[PDB]
Amino acid sequence: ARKVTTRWKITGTLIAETPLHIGGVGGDADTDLALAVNGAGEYYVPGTSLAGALRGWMTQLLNNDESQIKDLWGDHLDAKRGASFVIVDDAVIHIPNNADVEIREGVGIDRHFGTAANGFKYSRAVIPKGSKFKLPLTFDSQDDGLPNALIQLLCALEAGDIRLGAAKTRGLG
Amino acid sequence: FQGFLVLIETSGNQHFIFSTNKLRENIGASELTYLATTEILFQGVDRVFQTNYYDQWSDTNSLNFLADSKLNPAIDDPKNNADIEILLATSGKAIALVKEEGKAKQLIKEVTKQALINAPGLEIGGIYVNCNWQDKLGVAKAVKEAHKQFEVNRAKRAGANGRFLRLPIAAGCSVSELPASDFDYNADGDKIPVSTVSKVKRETAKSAKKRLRSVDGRLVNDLAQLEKSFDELDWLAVVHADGNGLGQILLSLEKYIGEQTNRNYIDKYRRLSLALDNCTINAFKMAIAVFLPIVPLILGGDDLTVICRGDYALEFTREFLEAFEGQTETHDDIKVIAQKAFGVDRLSACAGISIIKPHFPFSVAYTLAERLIKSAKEVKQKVTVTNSSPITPFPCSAIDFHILYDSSGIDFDRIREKLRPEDNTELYNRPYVVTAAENLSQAQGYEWSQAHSLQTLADRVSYLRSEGKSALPSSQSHALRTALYLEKNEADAQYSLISQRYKILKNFAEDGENKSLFHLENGKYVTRFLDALDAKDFFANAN
Amino acid sequence: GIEITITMQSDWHVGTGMGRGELDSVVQRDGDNLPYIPGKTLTGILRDSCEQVALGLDNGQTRGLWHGWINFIFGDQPALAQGAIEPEPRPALIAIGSAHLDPKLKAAFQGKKQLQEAIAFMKPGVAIDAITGTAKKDFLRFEEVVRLGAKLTAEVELNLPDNLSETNKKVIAGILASGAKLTERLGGKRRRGNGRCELKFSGYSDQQIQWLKDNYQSVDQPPKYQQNKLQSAGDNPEQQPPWHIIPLTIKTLSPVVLPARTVGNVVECLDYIPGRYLLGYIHKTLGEYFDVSQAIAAGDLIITNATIKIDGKAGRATPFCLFGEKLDGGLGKGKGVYNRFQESEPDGIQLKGERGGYVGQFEQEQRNLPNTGKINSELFTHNTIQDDVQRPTSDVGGVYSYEAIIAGQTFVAELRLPDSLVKQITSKNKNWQAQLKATIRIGQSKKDQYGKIEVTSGNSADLPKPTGNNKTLSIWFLSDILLRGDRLNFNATPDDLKKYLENALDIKLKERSDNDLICIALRSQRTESWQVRWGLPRPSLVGWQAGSCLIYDIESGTVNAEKLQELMITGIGDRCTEGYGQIGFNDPLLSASLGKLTAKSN
Amino acid sequence: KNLYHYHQYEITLESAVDSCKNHLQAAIGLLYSPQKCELVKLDNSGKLVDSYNRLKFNNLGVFEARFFNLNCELRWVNESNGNGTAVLLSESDITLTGFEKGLQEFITAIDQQYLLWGEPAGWQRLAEARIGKLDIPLDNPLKPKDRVFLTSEEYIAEVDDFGNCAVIDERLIKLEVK
Ligand SMILES: [Mg+2]
Ligand SMILES: [Mg+2]
Numbered sequence A: 001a002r003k004v005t006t007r008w009k010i011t012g013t014l015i016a017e018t019p020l021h022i023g024g025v026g027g028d029a030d031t032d033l034a035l036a037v038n039g040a041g042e043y044y045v046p047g048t049s050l051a052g053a054l055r056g057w058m059t060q061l062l063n064n065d066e067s068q069i070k071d072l073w074g075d076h077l078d079a080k081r082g083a084s085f086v087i088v089d090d091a092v093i094h095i096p097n098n099a100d101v102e103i104r105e106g107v108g109i110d111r112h113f114g115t116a117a118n119g120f121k122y123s124r125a126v127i128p129k130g131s132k133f134k135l136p137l138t139f140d141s142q143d144d145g146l147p148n149a150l151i152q153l154l155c156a157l158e159a160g161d162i163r164l165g166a167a168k169t170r171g172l173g
Numbered sequence B: 001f002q003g004f005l006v007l008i009e010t011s012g013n014q015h016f017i018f019s020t021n022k023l024r025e026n027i028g029a030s031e032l033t034y035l036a037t038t039e040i041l042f043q044g045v046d047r048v049f050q051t052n053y054y055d056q057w058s059d060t061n062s063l064n065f066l067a068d069s070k071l072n073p074a075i076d077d078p079k080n081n082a083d084i085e086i087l088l089a090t091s092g093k094a095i096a097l098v099k100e101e102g103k104a105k106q107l108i109k110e111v112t113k114q115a116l117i118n119a120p121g122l123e124i125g126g127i128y129v130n131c132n133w134q135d136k137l138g139v140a141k142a143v144k145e146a147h148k149q150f151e152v153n154r155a156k157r158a159g160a161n162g163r164f165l166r167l168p169i170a171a172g173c174s175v176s177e178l179p180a181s182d183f184d185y186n187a188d189g190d191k192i193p194v195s196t197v198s199k200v201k202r203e204t205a206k207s208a209k210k211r212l213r214s215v216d217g218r219l220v221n222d223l224a225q226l227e228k229s230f231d232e233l234d235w236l237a238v239v240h241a242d243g244n245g246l247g248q249i250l251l252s253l254e255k256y257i258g259e260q261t262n263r264n265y266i267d268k269y270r271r272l273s274l275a276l277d278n279c280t281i282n283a284f285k286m287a288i289a290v291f292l293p294i295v296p297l298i299l300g301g302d303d304l305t306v307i308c309r310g311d312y313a314l315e316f317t318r319e320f321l322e323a324f325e326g327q328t329e330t331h332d333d334i335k336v337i338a339q340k341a342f343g344v345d346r347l348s349a350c351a352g353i354s355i356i357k358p359h360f361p362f363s364v365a366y367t368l369a370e371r372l373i374k375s376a377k378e379v380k381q382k383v384t385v386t387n388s389s390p391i392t393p394f395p396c397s398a399i400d401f402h403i404l405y406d407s408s409g410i411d412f413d414r415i416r417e418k419l420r421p422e423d424n425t426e427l428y429n430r431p432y433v434v435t436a437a438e439n440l441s442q443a444q445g446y447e448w449s450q451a452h453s454l455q456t457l458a459d460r461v462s463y464l465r466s467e468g469k470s471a472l473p474s475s476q477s478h479a480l481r482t483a484l485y486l487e488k489n490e491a492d493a494q495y496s497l498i499s500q501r502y503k504i505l506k507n508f509a510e511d512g513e514n515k516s517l518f519h520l521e522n523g524k525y526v527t528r529f530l531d532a533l534d535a536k537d538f539f540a541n542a543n
Numbered sequence C: 001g002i003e004i005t006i007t008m009q010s011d012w013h014v015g016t017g018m019g020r021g022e023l024d025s026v027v028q029r030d031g032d033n034l035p036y037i038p039g040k041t042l043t044g045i046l047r048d049s050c051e052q053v054a055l056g057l058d059n060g061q062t063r064g065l066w067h068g069w070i071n072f073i074f075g076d077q078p079a080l081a082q083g084a085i086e087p088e089p090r091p092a093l094i095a096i097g098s099a100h101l102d103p104k105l106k107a108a109f110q111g112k113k114q115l116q117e118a119i120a121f122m123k124p125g126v127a128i129d130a131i132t133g134t135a136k137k138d139f140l141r142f143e144e145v146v147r148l149g150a151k152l153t154a155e156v157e158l159n160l161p162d163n164l165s166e167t168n169k170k171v172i173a174g175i176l177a178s179g180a181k182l183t184e185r186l187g188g189k190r191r192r193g194n195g196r197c198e199l200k201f202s203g204y205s206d207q208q209i210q211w212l213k214d215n216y217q218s219v220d221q222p223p224k225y226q227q228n229k230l231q232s233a234g235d236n237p238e239q240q241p242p243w244h245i246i247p248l249t250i251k252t253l254s255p256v257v258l259p260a261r262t263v264g265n266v267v268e269c270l271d272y273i274p275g276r277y278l279l280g281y282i283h284k285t286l287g288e289y290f291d292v293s294q295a296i297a298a299g300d301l302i303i304t305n306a307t308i309k310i311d312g313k314a315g316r317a318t319p320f321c322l323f324g325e326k327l328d329g330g331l332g333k334g335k336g337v338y339n340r341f342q343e344s345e346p347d348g349i350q351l352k353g354e355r356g357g358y359v360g361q362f363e364q365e366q367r368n369l370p371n372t373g374k375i376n377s378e379l380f381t382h383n384t385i386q387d388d389v390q391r392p393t394s395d396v397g398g399v400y401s402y403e404a405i406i407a408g409q410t411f412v413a414e415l416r417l418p419d420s421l422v423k424q425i426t427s428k429n430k431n432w433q434a435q436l437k438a439t440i441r442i443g444q445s446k447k448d449q450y451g452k453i454e455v456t457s458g459n460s461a462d463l464p465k466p467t468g469n470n471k472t473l474s475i476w477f478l479s480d481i482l483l484r485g486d487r488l489n490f491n492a493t494p495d496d497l498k499k500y501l502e503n504a505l506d507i508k509l510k511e512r513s514d515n516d517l518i519c520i521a522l523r524s525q526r527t528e529s530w531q532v533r534w535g536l537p538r539p540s541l542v543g544w545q546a547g548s549c550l551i552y553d554i555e556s557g558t559v560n561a562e563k564l565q566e567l568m569i570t571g572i573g574d575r576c577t578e579g580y581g582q583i584g585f586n587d588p589l590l591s592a593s594l595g596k597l598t599a600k601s602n
Numbered sequence D: 001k002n003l004y005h006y007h008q009y010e011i012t013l014e015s016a017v018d019s020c021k022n023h024l025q026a027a028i029g030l031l032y033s034p035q036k037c038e039l040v041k042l043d044n045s046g047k048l049v050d051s052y053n054r055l056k057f058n059n060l061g062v063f064e065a066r067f068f069n070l071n072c073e074l075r076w077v078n079e080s081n082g083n084g085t086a087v088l089l090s091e092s093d094i095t096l097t098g099f100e101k102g103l104q105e106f107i108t109a110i111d112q113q114y115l116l117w118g119e120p121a122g123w124q125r126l127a128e129a130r131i132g133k134l135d136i137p138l139d140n141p142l143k144p145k146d147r148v149f150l151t152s153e154e155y156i157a158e159v160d161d162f163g164n165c166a167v168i169d170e171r172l173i174k175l176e177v178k
């Protein structure tokens, strides 16, 4: 198989510091924009969506350097690289006790008349603040130790510098 | 007069040319096929009869020379001493008249021996039959007897598979079931074993340059840059196009020559074949205006197949088929025979068009084009000459095309049923007629042809493409697209939510009420809307 | 007796490049149209987890004692060879089938097309431009994922060597229990959370791992591989008439790959089972009663090809003398079929010759076209992963496809034995036909996903009894005929075939002279095949296809139906024991004129 | 040009090789048996050192054989319980006792090559991971980049009375390193 000097299982609790929205395909009769649910209908963070948030932040950290990012997150193009060394699982979101998915209303306000623009009325389901989900990372090290960029990533998560899901500029994530 | 008619014909062409996926072998294999009944025929004739057919071929690089009475005399009448006349020569077939049986026999020996040596694995044979000219119509009888007996004598003959027999200890060809015999090189320069069959194909890929570059100086000028160029490209398209009705004409041609005389049958029969060949070549030279990034694997007779740049193949084939119709209207030697056969002075062809991403296997993509051509060729039953009996297809030219977007599966039956979601409904109108509605107006099946007219698709694509912003947003086209996979009641429900918000949608309606994307057809519900969304980016033209 | 049970703990995706509707990628689905894990995925995933275990025990040495054990259990990977290897590649000890949903759940789905779709859902995916933070053009996909909580089970077979010491058996169980427990993910997008699983063997637990932990330092090299050589006795009776014919019914329980040829990267499949595939089962079941290897050498045994069952009987390869109307006729249309051995071509309408498929029975006053059977087939696409990049690459081929006969097809072969060999058996076992029921694996890739078939024996059928017509002799090739020229190579011709029958039957034959009626309708055939015992391909066999026909006017003498019967049993030409050479004389489907006829959850 | 061929019937393989031995000197042989396919080499007298026990049929024995050298090839195939047909094919007209002589004309003979399995691993050894080793009878040692080709001649002649040419036989010659 792929040689692995050490497998690191890196795990903890992630908490929503503001309401989340990871979108599904969209629309659900209750809202225009609808949360992603797993096959059991439970709300979850897809590991694709979380993995991309982490890979995204590292790319901003490493000044958009490709060369190092591909050595953690893997590649398809380079004949030497292929599959990802960081593995990110799906994580189910546990909403607080008695709490439930909230619907946020939205409107677009016509800049000339100062009133709601025609058609620009929408609503979004959001996971309430304080919901929890498991951090589900595995890392297959072929070198010794742990990459410092992967340590910076975990420091950034503990600092709460990473945002996940939609509407990141408008309150969420 | 008495003599013999020689028929020499090449079998198994589709297996020989199209099996191996390697572009150099498909080009190389198609070249060995063309040369066998031209270059090698004329060399064979010259070695037997002491004629100079090869010199005129190689100087002219065209078959038209054998039409000329000084260059290809009559065997009949004493006015000329000639003991050979070529009645016809073409890709895959040749026919000749010879006044002595031994030279008839020796000609077939000569041509086939050279094929065994210079073109191993090419299957070629011939037949000669007694031709009697004291029957006013014996030459037409000789042709039909020769074609009939050739099949029977093919069976009682040693096959092309009876050589290169495997011993247990001999390695394999990499590209064939045959035992390896030679070495060659991969595109990355790694050595590979090949058979003598594949070796000679790959060697011969260069020899095709000289022929095609006479068709146009742009074609196949550097084969390795074509392979490099195709990989850089976004889509390819295997185009296959085939002529309609010539086979029924030529099996019955005694009816259409006019004067029931051997000399007229020869003269008419020869000229028709050469005329078709020029019509195909001329129409191809017109069609390439839409684009160099085009490889003719086959071009001749009524038959074309090429690997085009994709997203230029609907227009190339449309332009080819329209140009081919226009050529056959204007060419005198077809006009009267077509006029007598089908009541209109033109012929027609249909095309199957795979459209494929460039790495996808050619041998699979060509097998689609063979199935798409069969669907396009269904017009040969739905549009027919009124009160003909037995019912003859009316000359109509049609396309069927795919656009794969897949990595493996490629079963035309799975492909088309997976977008036939409900028993009343099919989401494709895809055998599209390219013939102008004017020409068809006097056939049976006219209204069917108008529902299937390519201009309906090409118009709808323009509306999708029309605009500072989209007339119909993609955002909304994909809402409709999703609903089309539901029951028609739900599909019409979604359209009725939209149909007044986007005034362009009146043009996409098909009900005559501006309330459904579906029209009834043969009891089914069918739509063009999904063909227009698929083909939207495969209607580009340099014009 | 072993199973693997897989519990899927997150939504899972497998198997197909194709995509159907508004989804871009669709999951692999079995013959019930329900999602499942292909046995080649399961083997490849389980091997990979066992490879990690062995790579750890070797202290990271990529070759070593423990990688020897993996190659012992899972077979060698030729095409990873880096230098001269002199031993032939070992096959695997472990066969792992495909994992299917619970059979009682699968029954509930039957016919409920809307429910079969609901087992999965669309998962969206988007790729985002790193500087702008917005979705990239083109980078949108919607993907089918199957709902988590699916519990699937696979059959497993460990056909261990007949001599492995109990210490070594515990090592094998230790590794497999270890590799199963290390296996955590399978299918597509594993690295992004799809396809998390629990994989468990029946009867392997932490006790199997714990034994290995306690003992791995003691472990030796694996035993050497040895072929199961044949063994003859030479003791068979002489062959004596009659010939008993025992029908064997084959039913496919999983897809079967029967290699016709490879074109590009796709292996094409036959639509019948050649008799050579059944000799291994004949060896298994009857080699205890008589010397099966001597019987083959003497020709006292024939196992025919298995062809699709029609009318309760083996379907017969469509005769090339049948021609269909090119516009809208032929056996696929069920009308407009002409027997060109007896009927002229009609005026005007051109015909296409028949080229394949099988016809059911026909009788000399059928009033109908013979029942025509079709064989369903499916294309399965696979990949090969290069282990360091963990993705397929050109250096390991990486993509290939098998055509296969799908499950549920039924085929009929016939074992023929002379009376003297049935006496040999029946003196030893009165119920011997009961021992012919078996489940066996045939084909390419037989050890995993492909090739599982039921065999059932019928009751002894009657010997064929052709009509001894002295006017014309007509020969239908029910199977491929291999003849040797007088130089003992296969370049024989139809004139060699005339002499063969002429000499065999003691009659002189001449081609019928009627100008409208075709006398001969053959096609050439070439078979390329391996031989597993040799470890080298067979010599190439050349001949004529099944369905080929010819008819001769008898010049002198008289044809004897007794000898026609005997040739219809034993066949003609080379390798008749594999069912080559099987032939049909004066069958009325060649004699008749056909142009007028028409076809007949809980 | 004549390709000569000599036929004898109801002959055992041990007896066929013995009858032709004067012409099969140093002949390479290829023996087909139900368990294995064997290369062999006859010595310069034309004999196989263990011929009877190698060439017997009776117990999973050889059922088909080919023997070839520069001048001729012997073919044998079993037809009843170890009695077979011998056919020896030669460019030269040669006296053979008991064999029935015949010949056929051919137009031309073209040489052919068949690549043997594998790279180099008296007798030499080729090897390929697809098949393992193949020991081949070849006197010169092989360098690490060599290949061995079996070599042959294909004989072309008219088959049809319409003059269609075909290859009427292929004769094997020798192993050659390339
Ligand atoms: Mg909505
Ligand atoms: Mg795009």
Ligand SMILES: [Mg+2]
Residues within 6 Å of the ligand: C023, C024, C140, C141, C142
């Ligand atoms: Mg998509």
